[PDB]
Write an enzyme that holds these catalytic residues in place. Structure first.
Site, PDB file in Angstrom:
ATOM      1  N   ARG A   1      28.984  34.112  -8.691  1.00  4.84           N
ATOM      2  CA  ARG A   1      27.671  33.729  -9.265  1.00  4.84           C
ATOM      3  C   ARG A   1      26.700  33.459  -8.121  1.00  4.84           C
ATOM      4  O   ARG A   1      27.082  33.317  -6.945  1.00  4.84           O
ATOM      5  CB  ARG A   1      27.806  32.524 -10.182  1.00  4.84           C
TER       6      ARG A   1
ATOM      7  N   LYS B   1       0.870  -1.202   0.000  1.00  5.31           N
ATOM      8  CA  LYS B   1       0.000   0.000   0.000  1.00  5.31           C
ATOM      9  C   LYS B   1       0.889   1.228   0.000  1.00  5.31           C
ATOM     10  O   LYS B   1       1.816   1.283   0.792  1.00  5.31           O
ATOM     11  CB  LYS B   1      -0.943   0.043   1.201  1.00  5.31           C
TER      12      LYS B   1
ATOM     13  N   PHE C   1      32.956  29.293 -10.230  1.00  6.65           N
ATOM     14  CA  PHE C   1      33.109  28.130 -11.102  1.00  6.65           C
ATOM     15  C   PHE C   1      34.038  28.498 -12.243  1.00  6.65           C
ATOM     16  O   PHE C   1      33.630  29.045 -13.261  1.00  6.65           O
ATOM     17  CB  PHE C   1      31.757  27.533 -11.537  1.00  6.65           C
TER      18      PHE C   1
ATOM     19  N   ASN D   1      21.547  22.119  -9.648  1.00  2.00           N
ATOM     20  CA  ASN D   1      22.162  23.449  -9.785  1.00  2.00           C
ATOM     21  C   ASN D   1      21.113  24.298 -10.502  1.00  2.00           C
ATOM     22  O   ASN D   1      20.933  24.053 -11.682  1.00  2.00           O
ATOM     23  CB  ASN D   1      23.525  23.336 -10.463  1.00  2.00           C
TER      24      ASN D   1
ATOM     25  N   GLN E   1      30.197  20.350  -6.360  1.00  2.00           N
ATOM     26  CA  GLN E   1      30.958  19.112  -6.039  1.00  2.00           C
ATOM     27  C   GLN E   1      31.753  19.359  -4.745  1.00  2.00           C
ATOM     28  O   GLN E   1      31.685  18.544  -3.780  1.00  2.00           O
ATOM     29  CB  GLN E   1      31.882  18.757  -7.198  1.00  2.00           C
TER      30      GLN E   1
ATOM     31  N   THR F   1      -3.749  -5.578   0.459  1.00  2.00           N
ATOM     32  CA  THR F   1      -3.159  -4.226   0.649  1.00  2.00           C
ATOM     33  C   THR F   1      -4.073  -3.424   1.578  1.00  2.00           C
ATOM     34  O   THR F   1      -3.543  -2.682   2.396  1.00  2.00           O
ATOM     35  CB  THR F   1      -2.910  -3.517  -0.686  1.00  2.00           C
TER      36      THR F   1
ATOM     37  N   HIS G   1      19.812  27.296 -12.124  1.00  2.00           N
ATOM     38  CA  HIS G   1      20.574  28.387 -12.761  1.00  2.00           C
ATOM     39  C   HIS G   1      19.785  29.692 -12.735  1.00  2.00           C
ATOM     40  O   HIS G   1      18.578  29.707 -12.987  1.00  2.00           O
ATOM     41  CB  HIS G   1      20.954  27.985 -14.172  1.00  2.00           C
TER      42      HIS G   1
HETATM   43  O1  LIG Z   1      -5.654  -7.126  -7.137  1.00  2.00           O
HETATM   44  C1  LIG Z   1      -5.470  -6.932  -5.953  1.00  2.00           C
HETATM   45  N1  LIG Z   1      -4.323  -7.341  -5.344  1.00  2.00           N
HETATM   46  C2  LIG Z   1      -4.031  -7.213  -4.000  1.00  2.00           C
HETATM   47  O2  LIG Z   1      -2.924  -7.544  -3.579  1.00  2.00           O
HETATM   48  C3  LIG Z   1      -5.061  -6.559  -3.267  1.00  2.00           C
HETATM   49  N2  LIG Z   1      -5.127  -6.254  -1.942  1.00  2.00           N
HETATM   50  N3  LIG Z   1      -6.263  -5.657  -1.720  1.00  2.00           N
HETATM   51  N4  LIG Z   1      -6.939  -5.573  -2.871  1.00  2.00           N
HETATM   52  C4  LIG Z   1      -6.208  -6.103  -3.873  1.00  2.00           C
HETATM   53  N5  LIG Z   1      -6.424  -6.289  -5.195  1.00  2.00           N
HETATM   54  O1  LIG Z   2      29.143  23.827  -9.617  1.00  2.00           O
HETATM   55  C1  LIG Z   2      29.092  23.484 -10.780  1.00  2.00           C
HETATM   56  N1  LIG Z   2      29.446  22.225 -11.158  1.00  2.00           N
HETATM   57  C2  LIG Z   2      29.470  21.745 -12.453  1.00  2.00           C
HETATM   58  O2  LIG Z   2      29.727  20.562 -12.664  1.00  2.00           O
HETATM   59  C3  LIG Z   2      29.046  22.709 -13.410  1.00  2.00           C
HETATM   60  N2  LIG Z   2      28.934  22.602 -14.763  1.00  2.00           N
HETATM   61  N3  LIG Z   2      28.507  23.742 -15.226  1.00  2.00           N
HETATM   62  N4  LIG Z   2      28.345  24.589 -14.204  1.00  2.00           N
HETATM   63  C4  LIG Z   2      28.646  23.972 -13.043  1.00  2.00           C
HETATM   64  N5  LIG Z   2      28.673  24.368 -11.750  1.00  2.00           N
END
Ligand SMILES: O=c1[nH]c(=O)c2nn[nH]c2[nH]1
Ligand SMILES: O=c1[nH]c(=O)c2nn[nH]c2[nH]1
Ligand SMILES: O=c1[nH]c(=O)c2nn[nH]c2[nH]1
Ligand SMILES: O=c1[nH]c(=O)c2nn[nH]c2[nH]1
Ligand SMILES: [Ar]
Ligand SMILES: [Ar]
Ligand SMILES: [Ar]
Ligand SMILES: [Ar]
Ligand code: NA
Ligand code: NA
Ligand code: NA
Ligand code: NA
Lengths: 295, 295, 295, 295
Positions: A176, A10, A159, A254, A228, A57, A256
């Site tokens: 920058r 679920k 950079f 990043n 980096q 579920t 821009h």
């Molecule tokens: O098709 C279904 N599969 C499940 O595992 C399920 N569990 N509740 N309802 C469901 N319906």
């Molecule tokens: O911080 C940055 N890392 C990168 O790898 C990069 N490439 N273009 N600008 C960038 N700025």
């Protein structure tokens, strides 16, 4: 044909929990979105229409609400570990539970300089996340993260000195704008089970707070040579402050902001030292990743 | 057929501006999204393919960046009024300019308890907006707004005494969760032109701050009888504090959090006084509006 | 202070309905999102905390599902008119109902060249919408629309002869890409009430189909002088084909595709007649509107 | 600390290409969003602020547009392989290129039953995707996918015979709505390099078309025992029809449509055999995955 891998469960289960202190009258809310996926001896539901192996579920959804009723939901590392452990202990044929939690911010309001007992504000779409994998006989693997932390600095980013060839148009720069959305993940040492996760409970909130503080301070103070180089300084400090983390991963766009040449209009000066008005670019964006671990 | 109404221009123009104090070294950033639509004697561009009446939308975009370079961009009520006035003064055949501005948050970072000179964080998707209509011979109409302010209170909200008939299933309650996204608009008295807008400049930021503070305090402190009753108390206080506002409009969704009956599972008590775990509902939602003016 | 205007109700009500032909076995599905807002003698809910005048929004939601169970949901002009009329007839103090319906596409699947009896595909996020205002003593006002129709033509669009001044950088062109998302609204003559809406039922689907066909054919075949000139030709043809429409409104973004100069790289020719690779721009965008009515 | 993994490049690069047949006058458009991430001997950019190893992300963006100008952009498996191979051949210190392409639909318009030479419609947000990993000395790994294919069937879906325990509330059913968004990925056999990818070019479009057709026919015709059982039948047929595929992965949400009990209102019958009006649920949703490979 054969089933090589299968998981089901679920997604998008929204949960709110309130804690009410009867003494103080103070209420604290928690809101999360939960996903639980199971694996185990379930191939025959796919191959033979054998539903007898399926924990519906809908039942997984019920289990999340029952678990939240009976257990603390914070820190999320603990809640996810309790929820994942439940499935592999309750169901003989389920051998792995994968729990993803997104925690939404509800920050207590300050009214007239005092914390309000029961009123909250969503101060930003920043999330705190957990990924918990509970695997029978292999313990509990936890990845904690923060995401959606959007920052900008208007100077003290450079950079220059990058590779220049016949594909290169970018000018070198010594001043920058740098803006990013921070996605930071720290991976814990494998835990043997729930008792060991419980033994470390205080470290989860503290490490999240340290990761956030290190990210913000390093971003603000680094005279950045590149995304980096700045992100490596962040990861190195987190690993230094928490010995139970094995790896730190950053994923940083990043975002821009381009100078606008206005010199065509009455010789208006708006580039280099005279740059005041910029055009934020929605796309494309740089994407810089790294994973830092111990020597 | 006849043209009954026509407007055209440029939408989604992202603008960033930086202010650098040479004395203190402190930098302040502003980021907005701007839309400008024009009206006037332009019917023949539609009916006769007569482009001679069209100020290209690309030129409108250039004008926004040039205007931002040469003028303050704050408060946005002033910037929008300057930008709108430009078009009706420059172009004889343009008789109305409609300017919409969305202001994005860039909040100065606190590092080690000190404000950082050039580092910012996006603390929430809350916006401050302006709608400025500049109409030749009719002055300047300004609507100011805040939007995307998401709040929740976990108690001190009630809803009882509503109409009950054969369409009604909702139970009366004396204790519920109330959560909304606040959209609040205040409409200024008509201004004669730019000189009068300039004369009121200090009131724009102050009224925005008052609208925000009144919204948050009233939400937090009102033992709410309904969204309707709480929102009226907000609007009444804003109108009391700023005589140059004519009307205040609120538009509030009622974001429902439903109790979960867990009594089917081992008699678990999770309703009424025992309610701890709730299911946030994504949809549907109540939507409550009102416009409040002077007697 | 006084309430100048107030409306409230339920938004984002998702509804699905299935029709099952017992003869043929053929099933037809309808899925919509509905909003109902009411107005009337409700000021005291805002001013005096008097909930006795409030038809709970939860009851409005129940009413939408009951109305869909007991009535046809197509055409949406008819369903909206039935739903709006219900509120002003049932509740003495409610004097206006505002109904907005968004219809989602579920298109029957063709499998092996035959229409499938009960399988559907969502072929595009294009919507068919209705806005119905039912006002006691003023009849029923219906605006029908299509939205989210995204088109592109790769040639047979021009833009030259526009105003050139010191704000202008855009080059004239005789061959460009034109791409837009079509929002088209046709406003019906006022109807006296539900009997008159029922009398025109066949015209609603036919006029929607005509509006769509005229939009697509005119876009494809016009050697466009501007968005302005092409959209006017669309509106003029719709008004010519349906006498019960009073006005047609188009709102069209101009989604820009920019040439990329690659001449810096080995003299590669990618502009004007040699343009093959373009950069779609996410923002900003032109926005062109017009409303066309009868002489 | 040490760099354990690093990759960087440019995301969200929008590209449009037009092909013009001079003979027929027919134009064909292609629009994609491209991401290129590089790996190799780049650790010192992170650890030592050594930018000499960085191919600027701006240069990667230029390279994508130049590559699109000089090469076919269809099928995307071929374009991605050309683009990835470029980086590992041009740059001695780059050892892996990761190319992700999303292809957007531009479907030729039919006007008056004839295909239009230069007008297109976006018929649905369904995507065709490719993930290409080019690794020095390990060849080219291609994953092809379709995503965003949204379908619904109104009957001929069942779900009974699942595990029932104290967590279970779901009723067994022999007739329900089934609706999903299809994400299907087929993983090709490893290719030795570009010559081998070129040798298989006709298989890429044919396998995409087969994957789509098998998905739609199996969904429509299967009297489904579960999502699990229907998705396995799809995967088994794709693997049977294309020997160069190693694995097929499906990821399917179960988008729930709930019955609405209206019996509280005048005994209205709207459940089981009498169910006509349903409430689509936005969340939560079932999520069912499987990967199917060869015996
Ligand atoms: O098709 C279904 N599969 C499940 O595992 C399920 N569990 N509740 N309802 C469901 N319906
Ligand atoms: O911080 C940055 N890392 C990168 O790898 C990069 N490439 N273009 N600008 C960038 N700025
Ligand atoms: O069709 C167009 N209309 C306009 O108003 C315009 N302005 N710039 N480009 C444009 N294209
Ligand atoms: O505050 C509320 N106002 C209403 O109009 C309403 N209707 N249902 N619940 C409601 N809550
Ligand atoms: Ar950074
Ligand atoms: Ar409220
Ligand atoms: Ar157009
Ligand atoms: Ar399925
Ligand atoms: Na187990
Ligand atoms: Na004028
Ligand atoms: Na009435
Ligand atoms: Na190499």
């Amino acid at each position: 044909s054969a089933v090589k891998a299968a998981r089901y469960g679920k997604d998008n289960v929204r949960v709110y929990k309130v804690h009410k202190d009867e003494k103080t009258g103070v209420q604290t809310v928690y809101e999360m979105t939960v996903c639980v996926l199971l694996e185990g001896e379930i191939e025959t539901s796919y191959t033979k229409a054998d539903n007898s192996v399926i924990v519906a579920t809908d039942s997984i959804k019920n289990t999340i609400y029952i678990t939240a009723k009976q257990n603390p939901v914070t820190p999320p590392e603990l809640f996810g570990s309790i929820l994942g452990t439940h499935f592999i202990e309750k169901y003989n044929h389920i051998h792995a539970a994968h729990v993803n939690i997104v925690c939404h911010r509800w920050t207590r309001m300050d009214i007239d300089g005092k914390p309000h007992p029961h009123s909250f504000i969503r101060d930003s779409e920043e999330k705190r996340n957990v990924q918990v994998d509970v695997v029978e006989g292999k313990g509990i693997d936890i990845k904690s993260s923060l995401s959606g932390l959007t920052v900008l600095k208007s100077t003290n980013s450079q950079f220059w000195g990058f590779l220049r060839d016949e594909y290169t148009t970018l000018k070198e720069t010594w001043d920058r704008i740098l803006s990013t959305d921070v996605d930071a993940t720290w991976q814990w040492k494998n835990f043997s089970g729930l008792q060991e996760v419980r033994s470390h409970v205080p470290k989860f909130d503290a490490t999240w707070a340290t990761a956030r503080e290190v990210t913000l301070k390093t971003f603000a103070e680094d005279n950045s040579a590149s995304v980096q180089a700045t992100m490596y300084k962040m990861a190195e400090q987190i690993l230094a402050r928490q010995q139970l983390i094995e790896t730190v991963e950053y994923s940083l766009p990043n975002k821009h902001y381009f100078e606008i040449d206005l010199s065509w209009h009455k010789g208006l000066q708006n580039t280099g030292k005279n740059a005041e008005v910029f055009a934020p670019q929605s796309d494309p964006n740089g994407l810089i990743k790294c994973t830092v671990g111990r020597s």
